[PDB]
């Protein structure tokens, strides 16, 4: 809300890992890293044996927006978060994807903001590489993506 884009609208199309049963039920889903809720988070599998990395997670926001900066919030607090470089790709057709940046994840309680290629995007992945150092191991709360939106609809050149 406000400068960061509102996630109430925002869906996953396809995610490579997510924990349903391991966090019980409601929590540890792909869709909570981007529900915008604290409490809420996103575990990769464990409980019955982790998926293959890498790990991407394709969220679409429903609209054209120009990516400035994404934002990752972690746990920290009691949380180990192996979890040692992330990758951040954004596609304004799905099928062609472009590197925004690659940083480092810094296991913390408070967010990290990651400033990025400034590119119109209205999908956005988030890239869990198995060459960053990661573990099958991933525990993160939200996500989040500072930008602006952009329209493809005129109204009165469009009904």
């Not at 044996?49 to 790990?55: E, F, M, V």
């Not at 120009?66 to 972690?74: D, F, G, M, S």
């Amino acid at each position: 809300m406000g400068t960061t884009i509102s996630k109430s609208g925002w869906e996953v199309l396809s995610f490579t890992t997510q924990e349903a049963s391991g966090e019980g039920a409601g929590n540890g889903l792909a869709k909570c890293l981007i529900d915008g809720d604290t409490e809420t988070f996103w575990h990769a599998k464990w409980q019955g044996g982790s998926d293959p990395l890498p790990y991407d997670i394709v969220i679409d926001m429903k609209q054209n927006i120009q990516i400035a900066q994404v934002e990752l919030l972690p746990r920290g607090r009691g949380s180990n978060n192996p979890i040692k470089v992330v990758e951040f790709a954004a596609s304004e057709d799905n099928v062609n994807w472009t590197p925004i940046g690659r940083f480092g994840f810094t296991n913390q309680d408070a967010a990290l903001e990651y400033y990025v290629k400034s590119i119109k995007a209205r999908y956005i992945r988030l890239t869990i590489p198995d060459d960053g150092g990661n573990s099958t191991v991933a525990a993160i709360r939200e996500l989040d993506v500072k930008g602006t939106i952009i329209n493809l609809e005129h109204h009165h050149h469009h009904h």
